[PDB]
Amino acid sequence: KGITGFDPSLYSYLQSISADDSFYLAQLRRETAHLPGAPMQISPEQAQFLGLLISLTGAKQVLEIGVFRGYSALAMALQLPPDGQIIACDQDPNATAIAKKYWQKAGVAEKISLRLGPALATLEQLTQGKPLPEFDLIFIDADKRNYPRYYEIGLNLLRRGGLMVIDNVLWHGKVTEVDPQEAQTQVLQQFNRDLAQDERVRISVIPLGDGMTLALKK
Amino acid sequence: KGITGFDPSLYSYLQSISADDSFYLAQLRRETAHLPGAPMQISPEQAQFLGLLISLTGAKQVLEIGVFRGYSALAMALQLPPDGQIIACDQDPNATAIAKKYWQKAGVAEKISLRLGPALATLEQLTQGKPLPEFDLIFIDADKRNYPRYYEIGLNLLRRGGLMVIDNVLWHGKVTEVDPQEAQTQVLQQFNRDLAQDERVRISVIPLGDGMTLALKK
Numbered sequence A, B: 001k002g003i004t005g006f007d008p009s010l011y012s013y014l015q016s017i018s019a020d021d022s023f024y025l026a027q028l029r030r031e032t033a034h035l036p037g038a039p040m041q042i043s044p045e046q047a048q049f050l051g052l053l054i055s056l057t058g059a060k061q062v063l064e065i066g067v068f069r070g071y072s073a074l075a076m077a078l079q080l081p082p083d084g085q086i087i088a089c090d091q092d093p094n095a096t097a098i099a100k101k102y103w104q105k106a107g108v109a110e111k112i113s114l115r116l117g118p119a120l121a122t123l124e125q126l127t128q129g130k131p132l133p134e135f136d137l138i139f140i141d142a143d144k145r146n147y148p149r150y151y152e153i154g155l156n157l158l159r160r161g162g163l164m165v166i167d168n169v170l171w172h173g174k175v176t177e178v179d180p181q182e183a184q185t186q187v188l189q190q191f192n193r194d195l196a197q198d199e200r201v202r203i204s205v206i207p208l209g210d211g212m213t214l215a216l217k218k
């Protein structure tokens, strides 16, 4: 998917000087490139950056919303500590069944707990937990319509100092539309405007893939 | 300076949804915008990302190469722990004198140790130190001709797990030139190619400002 709004020629170069995916990440991405939905997955550049954040941050407790075939979860899982844990939320049983196949295949399935079913229902159960779980990092990358909800609910399930990571903030450049007619564009426009003055977090909008925002909880 | 190779219209939006600089950072950047060289400074987006990395990483020992009027050093310094320290290296006494004026003015001059004189001479003294200093993060942003040296020397002065940050890796898009005639372009082209297969680090090329690479030491 390259980089939204980035020069095609400069993106090719950026790729030239970027790191290849490890074996199983590359394999997962390579073997499923044919199946529909593959374009929804984060780019290889985002996966590398994502794994770099798990390491740099020291994260052990991760919460992913929007799993699909497990590519992003796998990227992070490969950098988790021996006691690292990922709670993966996804509504699709078929794509997620493929995710499970590759996680166990890479030996990180032990560090990933898939929660099949609507993400909101799962978040509600997490907040209803005794004691209240608190993740070091949360990756929001599912249905855009519910981003405001996932951010808010996840923000209280995030430790102070934790990092929220949201994908698709530049939404194919549609965010520049004056009167957006598409629902996801409208929801993302308001989401970005709201987050730009959310004084509970210190943010950084990064142009990798379809745009990703890093929100560090104060 | 926007973002090298990024859409001007999308960059304006990205700015719209980005965080403003704190008082003294904005003030420093605002009051010196008239002086020559101001365009060399990292963009506001990079400063925000830079401060976010100091926090997320837990860095206490920082090494900056390429100080100028102190903007980047100030961005990082404002996020340092009470015991945080920055060793700032710069050859220019006049621009650096202005840097000092703003650091003390923001109350972080206590956490910044300016080393005036050729960066190589200063790095040589740091490596000649007893005991050998080891930084958590190193920001290389000076004369491009010496990037290979600053990276190599700094890499051994960096702790394992530490983070190397290099600016200007996309060098005004000149990195795409087939037969670059400019020295900095040639040096940066080789630098990026060498770093892309440097197995001592895990990298990520980020398109913010004039391109910045994050190299996490294994």
Ligand SMILES: Nc1ncnc2c1ncn2[C@@H]1O[C@H](CSCC[C@H](N)C(=O)O)[C@@H](O)[C@H]1O
Pocket (backbone or CB within 6 Å): A040, A041, A042, A065, A066, A067, A068, A069, A070, A071, A072, A073, A089, A090, A091, A092, A095, A117, A118, A119, A120, A141, A142, A143
């Ligand atoms: N309401 C909902 N609850 C849970 N999952 C949902 C959902 N709406 C959409 N999803 C999931 O959101 C996912 C977005 S694609 C995720 C891609 C993955 N992060 C990667 O980069 O590899 C889809 O798999 C879809 O099944």
Ligand SMILES: Nc1ncnc2c1ncn2[C@@H]1O[C@H](CSCC[C@H](N)C(=O)O)[C@@H](O)[C@H]1O
Pocket (backbone or CB within 6 Å): B040, B041, B042, B065, B066, B067, B068, B069, B070, B071, B072, B073, B089, B090, B091, B092, B095, B117, B118, B119, B120, B141, B142, B143
């Ligand atoms: N050989 C050398 N040794 C030390 N400093 C050098 C040098 N060559 C260039 N420099 C310094 O490299 C700096 C690059 S500009 C630095 C901008 C600063 N990082 C910011 O973003 O605010 C200049 O101030 C120049 O004085």
Ligand SMILES: COc1cc(/C=C/C(=O)O)ccc1O
Pocket (backbone or CB within 6 Å): A039, A040, A041, A066, A141, A142, A143, A144, A167, A168
């Ligand atoms: C459903 O959520 C997503 C949708 C897309 C769609 C991409 C495209 O249409 O090319 C991409 C990434 C997503 O996370």
Ligand SMILES: COc1cc(/C=C/C(=O)O)ccc1O
Pocket (backbone or CB within 6 Å): B039, B040, B041, B066, B141, B142, B143, B144, B167, B168
């Ligand atoms: C000397 O090092 C630098 C030079 C420039 C030049 C920018 C321009 O010419 O517009 C920018 C950033 C630098 O770190």
Ligand SMILES: [Mg+2]
Pocket (backbone or CB within 6 Å): A040, A041, A042, A141, A167, A168, A210
């Ligand atoms: Mg996405």
Ligand SMILES: [Mg+2]
Pocket (backbone or CB within 6 Å): B040, B041, B042, B141, B167, B168, B210
């Ligand atoms: Mg620079």
